[PDB]
Design a protein around this ligand. Structure first.
Ligand SMILES: *[C@@H]1O[C@H](CO)[C@@H](O[C@@H]2O[C@H](CO)[C@@H](O)[C@H](O)[C@H]2NC(C)=O)[C@H](O)[C@H]1NC(C)=O
Ligand SMILES: *[C@@H]1O[C@H](CO)[C@@H](O)[C@H](O)[C@H]1NC(C)=O
Lengths: 53, 38
């Protein structure tokens, strides 16, 4: 209109959510509980010698 | 010693390295951040 140009109003997103990126250390000692559980049950068997004889 | 140069018409030029924007219009907006730890 005349010399000036008119532009439409811009709609705005109401909310934003922040989810930052985190470094991944990738440690291996955690989630190894099964090995500890296996260590718990060694179960060495010893039979008395001389009771039979 | 000294170093010399004669300005021809008494007009010199300065670098002036900052930009010049020449704004057109100003807008206003609203927004919510919603910080959550979950
Ligand atoms: C949290 O634990 C999850 C699951 O172990 C990790 O997600 C894995 O990430 C690796 C590396 O990018 C991928 O190769 C796997 O496919 C992912 N698995 C799943 C199920 O998503 C996640 O990286 C861990 N978070 C941190 C910060 O270490
Ligand atoms: C000033 O002039 C001398 C010679 O007259 C020259 O050796 C020197 O480099 C000059 N200094 C400048 C241009 O900064």
């Amino acid at each position: 209109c005349f010399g000036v140009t008119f532009k439409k109003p811009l709609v705005a997103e109401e909310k934003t959510s922040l989810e930052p990126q985190l470094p991944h250390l990738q440690l291996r000692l955690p989630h190894l509980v099964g090995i500890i559980a296996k260590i718990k049950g060694i179960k060495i068997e010893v039979t008395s010698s001389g009771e039979s004889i | 010693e000294v170093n010399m140069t004669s300005i021809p018409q008494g007009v010199f030029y300065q670098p002036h390295p900052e930009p010049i924007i020449h704004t057109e219009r100003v807008l206003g907006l609203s927004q919510v951040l919603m910080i959550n730890s979950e």
